[PDB]
């Protein structure tokens, strides 16, 4: 039967694998309501008969026709084209990220990222969107969509470690810098940053942690790798955390 | 109408109604989304009771991540996956499914056993954030070649830190923007230690000798790497990082030599 459906819709089985069927079915099916490359595309994801593949395309096409970019839509047919499972996955959460987050920037970053089809930023880039949207803050999502929109796998994943070391800390300040960061979008103090907050975290002194908060808020690249050496040392005498933290202070 | 009807065939097949439910709604991609979910479901307790969830909702898009995550789990013919994906299917949440579906799919090109065996892991504990951080790990050893790295994104992965993972998959991807490769070698040395700030410290300083311009100071970096020092990293980067704002391309090469 899935042949059946795969058939009306294609015409609109040799192989007889049910999943690549539907699965294709889904291509099929996504592709004649939507561009004319498009169609042509999930044609020859059929006639390459893999199961994971067709998956993945019919999502960045589900995902595509959800926002509504035409640009998301054509993307989707290049990623379908090419074919490659990985590249489709990290652009369908790009994608799923940017739809659940409410910013039309992030919608229009997302889209940008579909055409340059690279694996390694989407991921980065959705690592970025993830934490934006736990954070809670109107301010990080649209950090989320200037760093998406810039295509740097570097600044996403020195951000992402800022935010997810933030969030870890529980600190509203660290929070409150961290999103700052963002915004800021350096890579340099971002990592810094990222270091002073995870020494912090790891010698687990609140005032380490206040301290370090205080350091990403004033945002100087020089003074987090100065503090990070003072803490780091210090790591390697609770008596001393709370020293290096007060002259961080 | 056929897609309905391969639903309800499948959905007559021990199911949990919904069928109905989705007959009476008649949306295709929702339909045929359902329908590989359930399919696969068959195949495969907890999946076929945990499918339905699905089949309920009426989502295209949990459904399809769903039926990802348990096409994969059955590629990797491992149970311990097959369960994880049950309960990610009882979740319904496709942010999961996804960033799990990548992990697994990761996993299933790497060739690593021990990789495998902790993309079930992180299946298990559902954690969006390490599954994505492992993902990156994941994908950059595969792109990298060495045996070896691959084996670290293993262990990174069965240690399940999103910390490590990400420190991780940044020095590895500085350093295939890097083309030095003694960086690549070094930052392979790296994530087989998997010291969280070993890696950060490293990572500034490849990003400074990158930023810079200067292959001494990359040369220089990938040394360091090599040392795994944290200490000596963190000098060099203060070092590497006053000579990148002031732009002395005679400075940059003087502290990349003091690096060495």
Same mark, same amino acid.
């Given at each position: 039967?899935?042949?059946?459906?795969?058939?009306?819709?294609?015409?609109? *089985? #040799?192989?007889?694998?049910?999943?690549?069927?539907?699965?294709? !079915?889904?291509?099929?099916?996504?592709?004649?309501?939507?561009?004319?490359?498009?169609?042509?595309?999930?044609?020859?994801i059929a006639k390459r008969g893999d199961?994971?593949?067709?998956?993945?395309?019919?999502?960045?096409?589900?995902?595509?026709?959800?926002?509504?970019?035409?640009?998301?839509?054509?993307?989707?047919?290049?990623?379908? #084209?090419?074919?490659?499972?990985?590249? !489709?996955?990290?652009?369908?959460?790009?994608?799923?990220?940017?739809?659940?987050?409410?910013?039309?920037?992030?919608?229009?970053?997302?889209?940008?990222?579909?055409?340059?089809?690279?694996?390694?930023?989407?991921?980065?880039?959705?690592?970025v969107l993830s934490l934006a949207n736990k954070?809670?803050?109107?301010?990080?999502?649209?950090?989320?969509?200037?760093?998406?929109?810039?295509?740097?796998?570097?600044?996403?994943?020195?951000?992402?470690?800022?935010?997810?070391?933030?969030?870890?800390?529980?600190? *509203?300040?660290?929070?409150? !810098?961290?999103?700052?960061?963002?915004?800021?979008?350096?890579?340099?103090?971002?990592?810094?940053?990222?270091?002073?907050?995870?020494? !912090?975290?790891?010698?687990?002194?609140?005032?380490?942690?206040?301290?370090?908060?205080?350091?990403? #808020? *004033?945002?100087?690249?020089?003074?987090?790798?100065?503090?990070?050496?003072?803490?780091?040392?210090?790591?390697?005498?609770?008596?001393?955390?709370?020293?290096?933290?007060?002259?961080?202070?």
């Amino acid at each position: 039967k899935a042949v059946s459906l795969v058939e009306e819709l294609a015409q609109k *089985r #040799k192989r007889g694998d049910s999943e690549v069927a539907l699965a294709v !079915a889904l291509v099929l099916s996504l592709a004649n309501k939507s561009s004319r490359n498009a169609i042509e595309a999930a044609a020859e994801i059929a006639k390459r008969g893999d199961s994971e593949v067709a998956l993945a395309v019919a999502l960045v096409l589900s995902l595509a026709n959800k926002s509504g970019s035409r640009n998301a839509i054509e993307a989707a047919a290049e990623i379908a #084209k090419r074919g490659d499972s990985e590249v !489709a996955l990290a652009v369908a959460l790009v994608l799923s990220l940017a739809n659940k987050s409410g910013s039309r920037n992030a919608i229009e970053a997302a889209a940008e990222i579909a055409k340059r089809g690279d694996s390694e930023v989407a991921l980065a880039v959705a690592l970025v969107l993830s934490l934006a949207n736990k954070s809670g803050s109107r301010n990080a999502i649209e950090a989320a969509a200037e760093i998406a929109k810039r295509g740097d796998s570097e600044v996403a994943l020195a951000v992402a470690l800022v935010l997810s070391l933030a969030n870890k800390s529980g600190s *509203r300040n660290a929070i409150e !810098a961290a999103a700052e960061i963002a915004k800021r979008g350096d890579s340099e103090v971002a990592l810094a940053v990222a270091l002073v907050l995870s020494l !912090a975290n790891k010698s687990g002194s609140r005032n380490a942690i206040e301290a370090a908060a205080e350091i990403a #808020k *004033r945002g100087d690249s020089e003074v987090a790798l100065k503090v990070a050496l003072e803490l780091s040392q210090a790591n390697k005498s609770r008596d001393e955390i709370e020293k290096a933290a007060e002259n961080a202070k």
